[PDB]
Structures are given as C-alpha cells and as structure tokens.
C-alpha cells in the first residue's frame, strides 16, 4: 500500500505499451526500473496491462499462492506479459536480458484497502 503496491508496480508493471518485441525492451526496462541496481535479478515478468486491469484481478479467480495461499487471485483470461531473462554470464554490472513475450495468466496477491496487488506469484 505504501511500499508493497509500489514494489509491485516497480517490478512488474508497464502499462505504456501493449507489448514488447525485442531484447531492447528488457535491457532498458531492467535498467530503468533500476532492477539491475546492485544485483540484477535473473528473471522478471512485466505486465503490459493497465494497472486497473491488474488490480481487478484481486477480485477474480481465488487461488492458492505458491506459499500460504489465497489472498491469491488468478486473472480470468490472458494478460500481455513480457518475460525478461538474464544472459551474459558473469556476476557484476554485466547484465543482459532476452525479451520473451507471452500471453499468460497471472496469479497475484492482494492487500486490499481498496485493493492493491503487492506480490506477483507465478505467471501461470
């Protein structure tokens, strides 16, 4: 709500493009969202759907988190997703990514207040 909803939006949201067809997306994005900062994560998923669209999921199909469970919700249909996948070997500022584009469904956890997604569980 104050750091979680921001945390999620930081990592997973990109509602400015309907998609992403190129490794350029991933490389710029990870950098942009300073996701390479200090230590760039191996793999990250960006949702190309309006933030509202994503919040909406908080009141869709109720599932089981890959941990505790419910408070986990699954997207009815298919979401425009972009997968960012590390590539460039070495453990330093050397971070390159490949841009894989899918159309999968999302599993999100939601801290309502109104509703705000805070943790992006599995991407299908």
UniProtKB/Swiss-Prot annotation:
Subunit structure and binding partners: Interacts with and forms tight 1:1 complexes with RNH1. Dimerization of two such complexes may occur. Interaction with RNH1 inhibits this protein. Monomer.
Protein name in the entry: Ribonuclease pancreatic
GO cellular component: extracellular region
Subcellular location: Secreted
Residues noted as binding substrate in the record, renumbered to the chain: 7, 10, 41-45, 66, 85
One GO BP: defense response to Gram-positive bacterium
Keywords: Disulfide bond, Endonuclease, Glycation, Glycoprotein, Hydrolase, Lyase, Nuclease, Secreted, Signal
Species name: Bos taurus
Encoding gene per record: RNASE1
Section covered of the full-length record: 27 to 150 of 150
Enzyme class: lyase
